[PDB]
Amino acid sequence: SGAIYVGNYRVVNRHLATHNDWANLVWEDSSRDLLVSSTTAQGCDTIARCDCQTGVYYCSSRRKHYPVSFSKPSLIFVEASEYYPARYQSHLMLAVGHSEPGDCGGILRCQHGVVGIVSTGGNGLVGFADVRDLLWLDE
């Protein structure tokens, strides 16, 4: 679990969105596993606007932050689950590192700010849904 709070927005994994997230929907994309809902309270997370390929992510299954090199946002094949059939997930970045299903929502950050959130994993790899291209999160 986990979310990004920026201005009047809350960004979560789409497969983990609540009834309240859907009742206050701003934008959602199944192919990216992202959902953004509106919030009354003001968020103060800074989103990065960069092309970094190094950062630090939070791994709740180990209660630790890990430094990682990660790939550029791309279309990557993802196995079926109770949330999606087998498909390509776009805007996805991979790194060598530990993750478990409950790790989704953990933030990936670089020196510029929030890069994305954990969205997939397995076989010693962790996948992050990128948010740096969503320029509207700031306005």
Ligand X SMILES: NC(=O)[C@H]1CCCN(C(=O)Cc2cccc3nsnc23)C1
Binding site per annotation, positions for Zn(2+): 50, 52, 110, 112
Binding to ligand X by residue 122, rule CB under 6 A? yes
Distance CA 40, CA 68 (A): 34
Please say which residue, 14 or 132, places its beta carbon nearer to ligand X.
14
Q: Which two tokens stand for residue 87?
A: 């498909």
Select from 139, 71, 68 the least CA-distant residue to 109: 68
Please say which residue, 21 or 103, places its beta carbon nearer to ligand X.
103
Which residues are 24's β-sheet partners? none
- Our CA angle for 14, 49, 7, nearest 5°, is 60
Residue whose C-beta lies closest to ligand X: 121
Residue 110 interacting entry, from Zn ion, ligand X, none, C-beta within 5 to 8 Å by type: Zn ion
Mark whether 104 is an active-site residue: yes
Mark whether 65 is an active-site residue: no
Residue in 4, 11, 12, 104 binding ligand X, rule: CB under 6 A: 104
The answer to whether 85 and 16 have CB atoms below 8 angstroms apart is no
Mark whether 15 is an active-site residue: yes
Question: Taking the complex as a whole, how short is the minimal distance between the CB of residue 131 and Zn ion, in angstroms?
Answer: 12
Distance CA 62, CA 124 (A): 14
Binding to ligand X by residue 97, rule CB under 6 A? no
3-class DSSP state of 138: helix
Q: Which one of 33, 59, 91, 103 is the catalytic residue?
A: 33
3-class DSSP state of 37: strand
Which range touches ligand X (CB under 6 A), out of 18-26, 38-46, 75-83, 107-115? 75-83
Q: Which residues are catalytic?
A: 15, 33, 104
